[PDB]
Amino acid sequence: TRNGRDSESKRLGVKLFGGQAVKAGNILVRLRGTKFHAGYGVGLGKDHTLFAKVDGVVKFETKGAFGRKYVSIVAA
Amino acid sequence: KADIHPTYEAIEATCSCGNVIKTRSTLCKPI
Amino acid sequence: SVKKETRLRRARKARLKMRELETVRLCVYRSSQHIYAQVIAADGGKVLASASTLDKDLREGATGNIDAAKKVGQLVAERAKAAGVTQVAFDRSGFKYHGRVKALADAAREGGLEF
Amino acid sequence: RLKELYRKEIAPKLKEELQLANVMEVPRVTKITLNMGLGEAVGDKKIIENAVADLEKITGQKPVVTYARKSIAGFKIAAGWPIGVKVTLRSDRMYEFLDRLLSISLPRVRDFRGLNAKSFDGRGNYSMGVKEQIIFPEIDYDKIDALRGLDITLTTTARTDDEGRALLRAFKFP
Amino acid sequence: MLQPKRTKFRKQMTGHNRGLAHRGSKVSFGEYALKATSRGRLTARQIESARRALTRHVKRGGKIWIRVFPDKPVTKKPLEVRMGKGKGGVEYWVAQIQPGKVLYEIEGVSEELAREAFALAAAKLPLATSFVKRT
Amino acid sequence: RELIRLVSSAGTGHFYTTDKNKRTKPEKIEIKKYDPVVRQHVIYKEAKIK
Amino acid sequence: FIVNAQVRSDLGKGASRRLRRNAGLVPAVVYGGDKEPQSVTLELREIAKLLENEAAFSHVIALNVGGVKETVLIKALQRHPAKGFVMHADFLRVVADHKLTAHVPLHFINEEVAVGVKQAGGEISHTISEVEVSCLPKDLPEFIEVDMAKVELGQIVHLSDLKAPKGVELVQLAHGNDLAVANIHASR
RNA sequence: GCUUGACGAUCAUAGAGCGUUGGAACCACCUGAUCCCUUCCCGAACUCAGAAGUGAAACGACGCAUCGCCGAUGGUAGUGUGGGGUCUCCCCAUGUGAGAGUAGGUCAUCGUCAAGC
RNA sequence: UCCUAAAGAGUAACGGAGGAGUACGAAGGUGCGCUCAGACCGGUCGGAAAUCGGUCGCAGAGUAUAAAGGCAAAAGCGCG
């Protein structure tokens, strides 16, 4: 019945938007279960964190079947 | 006596009516 | 059919893994008549070399055994040496790695075409 | 047996009995399940093996046991997980199975009317009955208390009603 | 009164009542109707009171459609109550009304009897209403 | 889940530490693990942290 | 049926609101599958007199923009939801070889002589007028007759139960949607 | 220059449905399971040896817009900024501008390799 | 964990809703394989219902656990 109780608001979402230069370890998307999928040179960590495996710029392409949003890094 | 009772119901369309509604034919394994 | 759409679903994991790693691929396509072998570059959409059973020097009438796959083994290995490729990955294409798929893989591997 | 009658009469009877254009849509003969419902006394783990032993030698072939799917706790309990049994005799095994069902072993127990009369569902009816778990070779007066049942229907491996009543008969067999 | 049979939650926010009624503005079932021309709030005993005015002034037949439906619950703090001790409990129900919302519809009567029946209906409602026919 | 200790079958005194449900899996654990003090994989077989 | 029209070289929100409140006008468009769309101003007083007609929407309307005259079927209408008057009119080109769906009213002819009314006590419940059709412009039903004379108490007339006059395709019958047109039922 | 395979690009304007049509090459179904291999029980899947037959099933190509899916123009709603009003809401200037629906589309378009014509 | 929260983060209330103080040696790893659930219609103990044969099917199933978000390379399911 009685009612308080929130939690500490985990700061999720898109870091490193769609034209930005990335280094080879940077967190792309903090994610709660794959909104965005792992593209060309990006990694998919344990808690579905997208991180960069190479350098370049972020792409954010909507590719393929299943309508999936991909974060990929184009070496440019 | 009138106490014994068989219990067979998916045999029971008229013997080989095709399906009952579940559609395939002859013998019993998915082998 | 329900056989073929099942085996493409079986294959799809390794197909989709070899385009992540950027690996040149050695695909097979067994049929009930005979088997095909094909070398595909590291994007999926371009062919480096290709060697079938219906190359016109080994169409025989006994085509489609575990022997014809072993012939296609060196027949694709010596065509891939011309194309300049090692460190290829073997794609069994949802076929079980046991018979003429295994024989084609071993006979291509014997011709220095390194998996 | 599915033989001299089949490979020289039945497969050329049905091309001009159903007026089929080419051959192969003449019906083949494939697959069902018994689904012999051993879920009576569901919390057992002791009579399933007797049921498998019952169904083993009357079919000459090993079954598996078929497990429960849901926890439908109104009819019975949900912990009684092994509740089934199952054996196909193949087309290769149908030969000695066809001349053992309704060849000399048609009187299972009794009927007053085994009519081919009262089912118009558009899929190819027949008439025969199986309620006894004893009417088969290699069964005793008493060696184990035999409580079972065996369930066979047949379906078209083919299109429709009248295209599937005709292949299912083989002899003067109502 | 009209209440939902059960709702997913018990308390809503207060919210706002903006816009015009683009959906709900056509006489879709009847021939004549009581359309609102001002925005407001109908409290499910206003709705039933105007309903009874209509169904009692017809006396002969017809078919009356009640188009609005109170699905918004409204709370209340009781008296001698300090503010802010949790949100108060539900008392009644409310349909949010926009200008253009058709409230009631009738067929099977004459236009004169319909007009002087929706006059009785509009007498019991805190809105500014009007009379419309089927287009 | 009371915690246990998995000591190395090799001659060292290296131990990995974990839990176990005692009232369901009471037999001891013989999992092959990596010992750093000898730098090979060996079996670990222990309980009784005290 | 004739309306006068203009050219409308200025499009947008505040433009349209100025047409409605200053000039007294009403925006519109004319379009068909064969020509470019054309935006048009009309007069509210001059289109509101067409909308008074019962056969307004199921009829050829000649429409004169300049000296150019077009044949026009009104296939859309927007309307102020509270006050109730026409904002932009949104009508369609008419060609002699075209499928040309429009809405046509139902007209419910002889309801006093109804055997579910005179002998049996019951009332007629029109659930539907304004049936949508599919017809060449040569046959434009200004009305569609619905005979409710030989219909008993409790009985329902559907879309199959009435007439399609000389090559008129009722749209919902071309699907599996046989809608209920009218109704005779017991009173309250 | 087209047909059949395999692999991709793209993910419904590419789908589903209905109809016609394909066998010689190809593929599918097919024959048999000694032998590899397999069946919570299989040669009906997986596998091997095939070459008697069939294109019925499946798959492919061509048709059709009834279904699905795309989808204008115009208007409407919203809204940044600035100002008003009768200020729980709207209006004006200015910039922007949908969702829905309407007209109308769509029975895909590409590339690499291999056999055939 | 969701809302409030104003389409990046963050954001208060004795504001609105629910949960946790753990489980697991496989419920982890890997290789290989496989889809769930639902109506249907089937009466000689169950009769809407168990066991299956799936025609239509068209993710609505499942996920150790609350909610949200995710799942065909299934992250679901079975075996070595």
Side-chain angles (χ1 to χ4, degrees), chain A, chain B, chain C, chain D residues 2-34 37 39 41-44 46-69 73-74 78-101 103-107 109 111-114 116-117 119-120 122-129 131-132 134-135 137-147 149-170 174, chain E, chain F, chain G residues 1-50 55-147 149 151 153-176 178-187:
Chain A
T1 294
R2 286 179 181 267
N3 203 348
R5 282 177 277 104
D6 206 2
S7 65
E8 288 292 325
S9 180
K10 300 290 181 286
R11 272 80 173 166
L12 295 178
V14 175
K15 286 85 193 177
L16 292 175
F17 291 87
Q20 301 191 9
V22 299
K23 295 289 186 182
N26 295 337
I27 302 300
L28 294 172
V29 182
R30 292 303 188 105
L31 199 54
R32 192 61 68 209
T34 317
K35 298 267 188 73
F36 301 99
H37 281 76
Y40 177 74
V42 325
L44 192 67
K46 185 200 295 188
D47 55 354
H48 305 104
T49 301
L50 294 179
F51 63 96
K53 292 181 184 288
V54 294
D55 300 344
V57 297
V58 188
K59 181 71 175 67
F60 283 108
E61 183 65 25
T62 308
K63 186 182 285 292
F66 305 98
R68 292 187 288 184
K69 299 291 292 186
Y70 281 94
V71 185
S72 64
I73 47 186
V74 176
Chain B
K1 299 298 293 295
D3 55 355
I4 192 67
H5 206 281
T7 319
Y8 291 100
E9 67 196 10
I11 182 65
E12 279 184 343
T14 309
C15 181
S16 295
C17 199
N19 51 3
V20 287
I21 202 65
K22 294 183 71 70
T23 73
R24 73 201 197 185
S25 294
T26 307
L27 277 168
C28 298
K29 287 174 291 178
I31 62 162
Chain C
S1 68
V2 75
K3 288 174 66 171
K4 183 178 175 180
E5 77 180 2
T6 302
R7 57 167 283 270
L8 291 173
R9 188 174 66 244
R10 277 177 283 179
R12 186 64 185 267
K13 184 180 184 296
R15 318 304 306 273
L16 196 56
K17 179 63 177 180
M18 294 176 186
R19 287 191 293 278
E20 177 180 0
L21 295 168
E22 293 175 351
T23 307
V24 182
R25 189 172 66 241
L26 179 65
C27 285
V28 304
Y29 178 65
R30 185 189 69 187
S31 66
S32 64
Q33 282 297 109
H34 35 81
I35 195 163
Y36 303 164
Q38 191 171 6
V39 175
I40 298 168
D43 56 351
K46 194 264 183 184
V47 177
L48 296 167
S50 176
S52 177
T53 53
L54 48 86
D55 292 337
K56 61 102 172 180
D57 54 357
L58 57 93
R59 289 197 299 273
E60 61 180 359
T63 295
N65 293 320
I66 203 167
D67 194 5
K70 288 181 74 178
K71 293 173 70 177
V72 173
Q74 69 261 10
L75 206 278
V76 74
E78 66 186 0
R79 292 182 177 184
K81 291 295 181 295
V85 53
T86 183
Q87 66 184 359
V88 77
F90 181 74
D91 185 67
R92 61 184 180 86
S93 290
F95 296 133
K96 197 248 181 66
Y97 188 79
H98 192 268
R100 58 189 303 177
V101 171
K102 183 178 187 294
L104 176 56
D106 290 331
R109 195 183 292 171
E110 185 183 1
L113 193 270
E114 178 180 2
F115 296 171
Chain D
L2 192 62
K3 280 189 174 67
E4 173 182 1
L5 191 68
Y6 181 75
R7 274 98 70 180
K8 283 185 260 74
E9 192 179 359
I10 291 171
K13 278 197 266 76
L14 271 300
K15 291 193 264 77
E16 61 95 20
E17 187 172 2
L18 301 180
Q19 287 76 239
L20 296 176
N22 56 5
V23 173
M24 203 175 296
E25 71 269 18
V26 62
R28 193 174 177 264
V29 47
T30 59
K31 51 183 169 289
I32 203 179
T33 296
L34 290 103
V42 65
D44 46 359
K46 90 279 283 186
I47 63 170
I48 300 101
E49 294 85 6
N50 299 316
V52 170
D54 191 1
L55 200 140
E56 179 75 28
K57 189 163 185 283
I58 68 168
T59 60
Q61 199 168 9
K62 188 182 187 295
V64 298
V65 53
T66 313
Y67 290 163
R69 192 267 307 273
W81 197 257
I83 53 173
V85 65
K86 181 188 289 187
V87 171
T88 295
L89 280 83
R90 186 55 70 88
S91 298
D92 200 2
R93 286 186 296 272
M94 185 62 204
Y95 291 102
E96 60 93 18
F97 190 78
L98 180 56
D99 286 329
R100 187 259 304 276
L101 267 69
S103 68
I104 203 70
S105 179
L106 190 275
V109 279
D111 57 351
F112 72 101
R113 185 177 292 275
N116 204 167
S119 68
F120 288 167
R123 294 292 298 163
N125 59 1
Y126 189 71
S127 287
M128 190 270 174
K131 61 180 73 176
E132 187 185 9
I134 311 298
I135 182 67
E138 292 179 353
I139 192 67
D140 196 356
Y141 182 74
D142 189 3
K143 58 166 73 175
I144 296 97
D145 298 335
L147 299 176
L150 193 148
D151 302 333
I152 311 298
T153 81
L154 262 289
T155 312
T156 74
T157 63
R159 297 170 66 91
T160 56
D161 193 359
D162 49 359
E163 201 259 333
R165 298 190 186 98
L167 200 280
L168 208 155
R169 70 187 72 188
Chain E
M1 294 73 168
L2 289 171
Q3 304 179 1
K5 60 176 72 174
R6 91 292 197 283
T7 59
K8 185 164 68 178
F9 300 99
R10 294 174 64 185
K11 301 178 185 181
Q12 287 188 357
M13 298 314 196
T14 297
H16 289 281
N17 191 6
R18 292 184 179 96
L20 297 175
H22 296 91
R23 299 292 298 273
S25 64
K26 285 93 175 66
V27 188
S28 298
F29 299 101
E31 187 67 26
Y32 306 102
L34 183 64
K35 182 187 284 185
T37 61
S38 68
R39 76 185 71 252
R41 168 167 285 183
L42 295 179
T43 195
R45 64 181 67 193
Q46 293 164 1
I47 298 173
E48 179 59 32
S49 179
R51 202 277 307 163
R52 283 195 292 262
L54 289 171
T55 62
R56 189 176 58 238
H57 191 270
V58 289
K59 291 182 177 67
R60 179 67 175 84
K63 186 170 172 69
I64 297 172
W65 287 268
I66 301 99
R67 297 287 305 279
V68 292
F69 185 72
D71 56 351
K72 178 178 172 68
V74 175
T75 72
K76 180 73 178 177
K77 293 287 182 66
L79 279 77
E80 187 64 28
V81 169
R82 297 292 175 89
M83 297 188 68
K85 290 289 182 183
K87 186 176 183 176
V90 66
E91 283 286 326
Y92 58 90
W93 293 88
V94 150
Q96 283 185 352
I97 303 303
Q98 292 167 350
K101 178 70 173 175
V102 172
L103 308 178
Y104 301 102
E105 293 181 0
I106 194 165
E107 74 175 0
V109 294
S110 179
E111 196 271 337
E112 289 85 2
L113 185 63
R115 190 179 292 271
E116 67 189 4
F118 294 124
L120 268 298
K124 268 68 187 300
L125 294 180
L127 301 169
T129 65
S130 70
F131 182 75
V132 295
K133 298 179 292 297
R134 174 174 292 276
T135 59
Chain F
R1 299 285 294 172
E2 63 184 2
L3 58 88
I4 58 167
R5 175 176 286 172
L6 302 172
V7 84
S8 177
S9 295
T12 68
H14 180 76
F15 68 97
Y16 286 152
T17 319
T18 181
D19 297 339
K20 185 171 72 174
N21 192 4
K22 291 274 181 65
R23 72 179 71 190
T24 297
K25 264 62 183 299
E27 70 273 14
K28 291 180 185 292
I29 298 169
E30 61 267 18
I31 285 174
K32 191 79 172 295
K33 303 195 82 63
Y34 179 75
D35 191 357
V37 187
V38 299
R39 287 193 291 120
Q40 280 182 357
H41 283 81
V42 292
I43 306 101
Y44 286 18
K45 289 175 73 70
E46 193 60 30
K48 201 273 302 296
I49 59 166
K50 301 292 181 183
Chain G
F1 286 161
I2 175 67
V3 280
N4 297 321
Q6 287 85 13
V7 185
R8 197 187 173 195
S9 176
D10 186 66
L11 305 173
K13 181 186 285 190
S16 301
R17 295 191 176 189
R18 280 193 293 271
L19 262 70
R20 293 180 181 97
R21 78 179 189 272
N22 297 324
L25 297 180
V26 165
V29 281
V30 207
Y31 56 89
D34 287 328
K35 292 172 70 173
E36 284 289 326
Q38 187 179 6
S39 298
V40 155
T41 71
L42 302 176
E43 288 82 8
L44 182 59
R45 182 184 53 83
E46 202 267 334
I47 195 70
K49 193 183 287 187
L50 282 196
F57 302 99
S58 65
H59 195 276
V60 158
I61 289 168
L63 189 137
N64 202 3
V65 179
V68 283
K69 297 183 100 292
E70 285 83 4
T71 300
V72 156
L73 192 277
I74 299 175
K75 191 173 177 63
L77 191 61
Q78 192 153 352
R79 192 177 288 276
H80 190 79
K83 296 177 76 70
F85 54 89
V86 178
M87 49 190 65
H88 100 297
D90 195 357
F91 35 69
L92 175 65
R93 261 67 167 267
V94 177
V95 192
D97 51 356
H98 192 268
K99 188 60 74 69
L100 189 62
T101 60
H103 291 91
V104 176
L106 298 174
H107 277 262
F108 292 138
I109 46 168
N110 47 3
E111 290 172 345
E112 190 179 4
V113 282
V115 301
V117 171
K118 296 290 283 186
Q119 297 87 15
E123 298 177 355
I124 306 102
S125 176
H126 315 109
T127 61
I128 282 169
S129 180
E130 292 184 355
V131 60
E132 61 173 0
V133 299
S134 176
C135 62
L136 292 170
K138 183 59 68 180
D139 43 350
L140 289 174
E142 296 181 356
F143 66 97
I144 286 174
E145 175 185 359
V146 177
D147 195 0
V151 286
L153 193 277
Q155 196 271 339
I156 300 99
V157 51
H158 295 89
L159 285 177
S160 297
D161 298 328
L162 74 156
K163 183 173 72 175
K166 189 178 166 63
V168 169
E169 179 71 30
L170 300 175
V171 175
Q172 299 293 322
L173 286 173
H175 301 289
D178 194 357
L179 271 58
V181 177
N183 207 167
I184 305 98
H185 67 91
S187 66

